[PDB]
Amino acid sequence: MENFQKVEKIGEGTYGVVYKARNKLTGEVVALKKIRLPSTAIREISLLKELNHPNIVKLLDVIHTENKLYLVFEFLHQDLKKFMDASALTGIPLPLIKSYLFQLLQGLAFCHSHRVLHRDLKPQNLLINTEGAIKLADFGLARAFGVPVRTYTHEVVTLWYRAPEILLGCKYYSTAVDIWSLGCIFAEMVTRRALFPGDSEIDQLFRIFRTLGTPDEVVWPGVTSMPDYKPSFPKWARQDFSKVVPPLDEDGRSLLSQMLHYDPNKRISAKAALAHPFFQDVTKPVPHLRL
Numbered sequence: 001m002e003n004f005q006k007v008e009k010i011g012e013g014t015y016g017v018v019y020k021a022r023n024k025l026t027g028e029v030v031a032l033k034k035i036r037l038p039s040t041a042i043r044e045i046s047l048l049k050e051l052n053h054p055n056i057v058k059l060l061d062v063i064h065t066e067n068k069l070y071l072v073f074e075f076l077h078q079d080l081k082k083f084m085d086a087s088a089l090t091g092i093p094l095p096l097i098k099s100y101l102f103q104l105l106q107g108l109a110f111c112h113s114h115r116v117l118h119r120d121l122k123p124q125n126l127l128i129n130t131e132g133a134i135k136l137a138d139f140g141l142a143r144a145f146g147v148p149v150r151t152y153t154h155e156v157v158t159l160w161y162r163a164p165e166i167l168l169g170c171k172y173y174s175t176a177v178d179i180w181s182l183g184c185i186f187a188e189m190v191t192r193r194a195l196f197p198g199d200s201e202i203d204q205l206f207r208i209f210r211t212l213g214t215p216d217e218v219v220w221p222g223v224t225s226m227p228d229y230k231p232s233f234p235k236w237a238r239q240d241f242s243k244v245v246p247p248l249d250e251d252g253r254s255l256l257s258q259m260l261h262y263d264p265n266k267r268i269s270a271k272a273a274l275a276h277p278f279f280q281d282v283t284k285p286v287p288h289l290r291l
């Protein structure tokens, strides 16, 4: 770590704090994730160094030294969260929303083809550059490790993009959890409001049920047998997407509805989503970035 000079803090994840830093050997600026503290973890994270794609933030190095684990990522100039906040008065242009969703589906189709799941997509780990690219950052493992950031900071775990199977206690979930999260982020880019801003696990689940209807065996076979399912859940009727994401057109609303299917087996895959008619006229616009 003597080779890196911290510039400023740029983020706080669930298990690590992220800094902008300078590599003293090469002169390059990087994003450095510091995890406060497992051999299986070192091996699995090292496998992520091989997972290279245009829509994935490059994991440059894994440094294991003195009861800390440092992840060195390529540096991108802004996150989607800052861009959405900066665009709150005007809205992100629909062609740019479509480009970003298309690129993130390309990134997910690639990592899902290598049986790599993100598991915690959110605007703070979607990174953009001045050329119009957007990239997925910091893929999570199935087994969590290290001191959680919430125990030594004022930061809280966001549940807003969590798939309903995770909230209902499925421990052997699929790549469909990332498609759900991405659908939630797509709706938030379009409407400029989070789709399901829950502040507890039950509030998160009941916000999903109030919009999409309480799931039952008809729409989700096996839902009533899931670990955290309760027959005492209130029964809410489903709402129309025309109410949930105006002014999205019918192709975008149909795609979103397929990304938000309750049954993970019915939920569209990233590969199938790339072929959706919504992307017939996709382009790659330039964002207006204030850095």
Ligand SMILES: Cc1nc(C)c(-c2ccnc(Nc3ccc(N(C)C)c(Cl)c3)n2)s1
Residues within 6 Å of the ligand: 010, 011, 012, 013, 018, 031, 033, 057, 073, 074, 075, 076, 077, 078, 079, 082, 124, 125, 127, 137, 138
């Ligand atoms: C939570 C995160 N995890 C990672 C690994 C992150 C990462 C990876 C690569 N580049 C960047 N850049 C970046 C992020 C945020 C900001 N401001 C707007 C908060 C900036 Cl100015 C740059 N962040 S951000």
